[PDB]
């Protein structure tokens, strides 16, 4: 069952070489409510006039993207999303550009971000965190085998589907990396030390981020927090972690080998690869196969009210979509 990965690499290679282009237009969708806002874009709930199906539509202002030096990151995002396929990665359904914007329309995930659930209840139990963690391990195994590094693992980007399973969204920082890359990007709390020290770094930054996610899920706070990003950066590069007293000793152990500044010593990045993680004490009762197949009982199944309910998501203030009458960033996005 590494033949699964061989076929997965061949499909990804084929979808990589010849990418779908311009497969819907704005005026086929009714825009409803913003469901989230980012540094660069915003995502709206959306109803396709012809089938009536609901989607999540990311909108990106081409000019804002050129301003914040996010072009290749934006081309990377689309190219990768259209080229991948895995249960716990959100489907891209359509993409297109008009005079002013890039648009990526994806499956609607109605349970809201892990982030909001987690903040409301403080923390998750260890069996629950474990169940969420397993999905990410499987997903990182998959993406790394395609030489894909993700780079923005965080509660905010993990949406909970109707079966209570994760769907990972926001591939803004996902890059196809042979060996090594250098862009300072990510989210401060989740950044590996390599990135902060402007070192030049590999897929092992995602395993670092995974340790943080699991800490935060089980602690209710991140292992490195302060009021400003540079100060988080100092806490991180110290490599100085304290676990709550209730973390099980298996969890302390896993987290120490994940929250490990020394690359030669970091789980994920070793002779044994991902199996150092999969075969570790704390994941011992995890059925990896039943997880991939979604046959495990989920910690919790979100409140359903209907097609087009957004009670699981916070409210944002709106901004209307202006399309311009003259094209705005031609050759920069020729390939989108």
């Amino acid at each position: 069952v590494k033949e699964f990965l061989a076929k997965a690499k061949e499909d990804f290679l084929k979808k990589w070489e010849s990418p779908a282009q311009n497969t819907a237009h704005l005026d086929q969708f009714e825009r409803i409510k913003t469901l989230g806002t980012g540094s660069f874009g915003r995502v709206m709930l959306v109803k396709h006039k012809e089938t009536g199906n609901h989607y999540a539509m990311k909108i990106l202002d081409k000019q804002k993207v050129v301003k914040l030096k996010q072009i290749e990151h934006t081309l990377n995002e689309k190219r990768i999303l259209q080229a991948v396929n895995f249960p716990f990665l959100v489907k891209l359904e359509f993409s297109f550009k008009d005079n002013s914007n890039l648009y990526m329309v994806m499956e609607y995930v109605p349970g809201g971000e892990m982030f909001s659930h987690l903040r409301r209840i403080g923390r998750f139990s260890e069996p629950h965190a474990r169940f969420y963690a397993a999905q990410i391990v499987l997903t990182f195994e998959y993406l790394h085998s395609l030489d894909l590094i993700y780079r923005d693992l965080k509660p905010e980007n993990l949406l909970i589907d109707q079966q209570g399973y994760i769907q990972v969204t926001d591939f803004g920082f996902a890059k196809r990396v042979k060996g090594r890359t250098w862009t300072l990007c990510g989210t401060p709390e989740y950044l590996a030390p390599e990135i902060i020290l402007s070192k030049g770094y590999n897929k092992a930054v995602d395993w670092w981020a995974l340790g943080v996610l699991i800490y935060e899920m089980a602690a209710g706070y991140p292992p490195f927090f302060a009021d400003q990003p540079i100060q988080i950066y100092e806490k991180i590069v110290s490599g100085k972690v304290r676990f709550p007293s209730h973390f099980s000793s298996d969890l302390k152990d896993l987290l120490r080998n994940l929250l490990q500044v020394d690359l030669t010593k970091r789980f994920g990045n070793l002779k044994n690869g991902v199996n150092d993680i999969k075969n570790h004490k704390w994941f011992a009762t995890t059925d990896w196969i039943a997880i991939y197949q979604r046959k495990v009982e989920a910690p919790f199944i979100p409140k359903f009210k209907g097609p087009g309910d957004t009670s699981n998501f916070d409210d944002y203030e709106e901004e209307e979509i202006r399309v311009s009458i003259n094209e705005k960033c031609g050759k920069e996005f020729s390939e989108f």
Partner: peptide, 20 residues
Amino acid sequence: TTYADFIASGRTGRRNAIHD
């Protein structure tokens, strides 16, 4: 408590990606 410390910090909302 550390959580008490976390709750009173100024980083308890959605966190944004870093720019440059």
